[PDB]
């Protein structure tokens, strides 16, 4: 008899978490330049509520934008661990997705998924500001929906048992 209030509580929590998906102020390369352009007045990420937070301890969205190398992978893992929970991860750009042009480079991490868990990926190299906004919106929709994904089964009284 605890799921009745929890479901409205889950919905309110999902709305609140979607409303304050603060991206991490952590950018590296041209993909991050495009992401910064997506923070411009023309591309109002503030309309969806995305405000960049400098500290991982106070951040929720990790916008991995740039190329990862052998000299930055441990730092990326440490930042991912230091990110406050719950956390979401979005890798923007081909380098952050799979290395891109440097997929055959000796000084390339050869994929950000092999270093930290990634929730969403963006294809463009660089992705457009519209592409980054669409990816952020999809991630927000998934986070709002993932809170109550119907994992529990409904009893004979239409109650999640």
């Amino acid at each position: 008899r605890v799921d009745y209030i929890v479901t409205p509580i889950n919905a309110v929590v999902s709305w609140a978490r979607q409303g304050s998906f603060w991206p991490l102020t952590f950018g590296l390369a041209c993909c991050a330049v495009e992401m910064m352009h997506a923070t411009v007045s023309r591309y109002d990420f503030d309309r969806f509520g995305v405000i960049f937070r400098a500290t991982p301890r106070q951040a929720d969205l990790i916008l991995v934008a740039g190329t990862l190398t052998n000299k930055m992978a441990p730092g990326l893992r440490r930042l991912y661990e230091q990110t406050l929970d719950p956390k979401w991860v979005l890798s923007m750009g081909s380098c952050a997705n799979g290395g891109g042009y440097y997929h055959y480079s000796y000084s390339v991490v050869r994929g950000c998924n092999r270093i930290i868990p990634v929730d969403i990926y963006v294809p463009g190299c660089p992705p457009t500001a519209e592409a980054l906004m669409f990816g952020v919106l999809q991630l927000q929709k998934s986070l709002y929906r993932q809170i109550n994904e119907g994992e529990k089964k409904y009893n004979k009284k239409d109650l999640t048992y």
């Binding site: 052998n70 000299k71 992978a73 893992r77 055959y104 000796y106 000084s107 050869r110 270093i115």
Partner: protein, 198 residues
Amino acid sequence: MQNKYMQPIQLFIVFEKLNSKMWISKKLNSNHSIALIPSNWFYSINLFLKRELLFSNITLIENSAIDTISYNLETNQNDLDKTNIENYFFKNKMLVFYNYYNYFLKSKLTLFIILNNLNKSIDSIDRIFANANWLERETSEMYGINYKWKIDTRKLLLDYSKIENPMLKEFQSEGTQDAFYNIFENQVVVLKNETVEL
């Protein structure tokens, strides 16, 4: 090339012991001249350039090494001349080219030093030109050119705990070591590189 150009023969005049070999081509600009120099009188040449009137107003523009070990003329082999940088590179094992710009003469000079010793050790111009610190550090980190008596031998761009010279003719594109996330260690570990081939 409609501007006033002249060979900097004053270098060999002051040296009075080195057979001067200068080259000027239309591939570069009208104020670019390239000369080969012996490594023995290399610091002496650098000091003489750094502290001489009509030449003291100079600044080091770039510095780069060429792995002349495997640099081979691909086509038009019969077209090689008897005073060609291609033949000179084919003769030697490495060629260090330092390009400076002289504002007093408003010209470009390129000193090419041929390295054949297995150690690839040459004197350091870091104590002469300030920008040569980071440049020589990167050059040593990438090609293994040992700048003797250098200001700083610390690494510049190579990954931490990695001992290699990626900018070498022997090194393959993929390298040998790749870093993954070791759950058994709860951190990033490094193993052999198994790369996908085209």
